[PDB]
Amino acid sequence: PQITLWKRPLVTIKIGGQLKEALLDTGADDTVIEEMSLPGRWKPKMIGGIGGFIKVRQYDQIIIEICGHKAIGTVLVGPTPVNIIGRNLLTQIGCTLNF
Amino acid sequence: PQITLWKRPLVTIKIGGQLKEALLDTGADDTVIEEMSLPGRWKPKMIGGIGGFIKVRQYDQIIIEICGHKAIGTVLVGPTPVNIIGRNLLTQIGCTLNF
Numbered sequence: 452p453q454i455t456l457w458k459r460p461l462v463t464i465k466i467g468g469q470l471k472e473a474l475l476d477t478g479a480d481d482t483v484i485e486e487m488s489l490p491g492r493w494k495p496k497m498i499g500g501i502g503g504f505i506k507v508r509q510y511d512q513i514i515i516e517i518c519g520h521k522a523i524g525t526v527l528v529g530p531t532p533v534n535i536i537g538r539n540l541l542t543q544i545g546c547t548l549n550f
Numbered sequence: 551p552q553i554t555l556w557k558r559p560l561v562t563i564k565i566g567g568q569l570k571e572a573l574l575d576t577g578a579d580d581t582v583i584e585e586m587s588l589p590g591r592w593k594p595k596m597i598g599g600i601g602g603f604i605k606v607r608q609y610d611q612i613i614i615e616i617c618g619h620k621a622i623g624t625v626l627v628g629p630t631p632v633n634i635i636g637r638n639l640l641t642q643i644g645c646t647l648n649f
């Protein structure tokens with residue numbers, strides 16, 4: 452739908468069998484979820500942000516049901532303070548910025 | 551106009567007279583800009599990023615032209631990786647998220 456930005460755009464995502472809320476962040480390239488157990492193999496890597504870099508585990512092709520729609524792609528797991536849905540998944544559910 | 555998220559939603563902003571590149575970040579509450587000279591008096595602030603917190607100088611009433619549209623609000627100046635345009639100034643231009 453259309454989402455106004457007076458409030459944090461927080462949605463409910465279904466991932467790895469668990470429900471979690473996340474923030475739609477158009478600024479982020481990837482999707483960073485809090486430390487949790489996901490199945491598969493992963494390669495460790497470091498993403499940087501405001502404040503510095505954090506070490507994370509990159510799992511490939513994971514399915515996420517972000518707000519009623521499914522999407523597949525990479526998910527980085529680690530010590531992030533908030534669950535963030537980034538560009539690599541926002542494009543899959545057809546999200547655009549309009550003004 | 552309408553922006554698809556296949557590439558970084560970078561825009562040309564005009565602040566302080568200089569032209570700068572900025573990222574439209576819907577997850578960011580406030581606008582954070584790399585170091586520079588702005589007018590007035592400031593207050594201190596700490597904003598929480600993915601990798602931790604950083605200290606910033608808050609300036610209010612700053613005139614700013616986000617790709618054509620001119621908004622007037624608070625800008626935080628600090629040690630950021632890239633200039634971010636947050637919701638405080640994104641609601642001023644009428645920006646929304648659609649899908």
Ligand SMILES: N#Cc1ccc(S(=O)(=O)Nc2cccc([C@@H](c3c(O)c4c(oc3=O)CCCCCC4)C3CC3)c2)cc1
Nearest residue numbers: 476478479499500501533575577578579580597598599600
């Ligand atoms: N929930 C929440 C929430 C908590 C704090 C804040 S805050 O005070 O605005 N601080 C604040 C200010 C500006 C941005 C941010 C975010 C953030 C990004 O969107 C991006 C990156 O690192 C980040 O920390 C990576 C590279 C730089 C830009 C690209 C994407 C946080 C939400 C994840 C937080 C905002 C929201």
